[PDB]
């Protein structure tokens, strides 16, 4: 079975927390990015089988996607904002590592990342 298991969105052994920053990441940051015209490739784990990209998970060993981030936030999976911001950064970095510059998916990621950075700049104080 060529796809790996997706990243966990819950873990009963991982301490859970709600902070005003994590509330902002779900209510403002994720919601803004999720509805974007370019969001759809990022809304679920890369299906490297269906995309016929057998090398994707040979190259990308820390996969991440906004579907996973959305469920982690809804589940209060995170302890802090940094864990969630790290997942967004991983999602973007994976896209830039795997794909060639100028690819449609790269321009799409760049547009979402510019919007992500705008919203992260307005992160409230804890
Ligand atoms: C996120 C990422 O790097 N990739 C990805 C993931 C999911 C989906 C998809 N079809 O859901 C598609 C892609 C990318 N392919 C693509 N082709 C055309 C357009 Cl208009 C947008 N993307 C490749 C890449 C592995």
Say if ligand 1 is within 6 A of residue 42 CB.
Answer: yes
Residue 75, token pair as written in the block: 């589940």
Say if ligand 1 is within 6 A of residue 98 CB.
Answer: yes
**Cα dihedral across residues 26, 31, 33, 38: positive or negative:** positive
Q: Ligand 1 pocket test: which of 46, 49, 93 has the largest number of ligand atoms within 8 Å of its C-beta?
A: 46
> What is the experimental resolution, given in Å to one decimal place?
1.7
| Domains in the chain, CATH or no CATH each | 19-123 (1.20.920.10)
50, with CB counted inside 10 A (0-12, 13-18, 19+), is exposed
- Cα distance from N-terminal residue to C-terminal residue, the chain: 43
HSE of 107, CA atoms in CB hemisphere, 13 A: 4
Q: By C-alpha distance, which of 19, 32, 28, 8 is closest to 80?
A: 19
Atom of ligand 1 nearest to the CA of 56: 25
Angle at 22 between CA 19 and CA 28, to 5 degrees: 130
Whether residue 48 contacts residue 60, with contact meaning beta carbons closer than 8 Å, is answered with: no
Cα-to-centroid distance, 21 and ligand 1 (Å): 30
């Amino acid at each position: 079975s060529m796809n790996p298991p997706p990243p966990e969105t819950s873990n009963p052994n991982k301490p859970k927390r709600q902070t005003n920053q994590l509330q902002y990441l779900l209510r403002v940051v994720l919601k803004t990015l999720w509805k974007h015209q370019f969001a759809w490739p990022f809304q679920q784990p890369v299906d490297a089988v269906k995309l016929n990209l057998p090398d994707y998970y040979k190259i990308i060993k820390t996969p991440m996607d906004m579907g996973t981030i959305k469920k982690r936030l809804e589940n209060n999976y995170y302890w802090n904002a940094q864990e969630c911001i790290q997942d967004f950064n991983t999602m973007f970095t994976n896209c830039y590592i795997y794909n060639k510059p100028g690819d449609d998916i790269v321009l799409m990621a760049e547009a979402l990342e510019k919007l992500f950075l705008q919203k992260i700049n307005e992160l409230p104080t804890e």
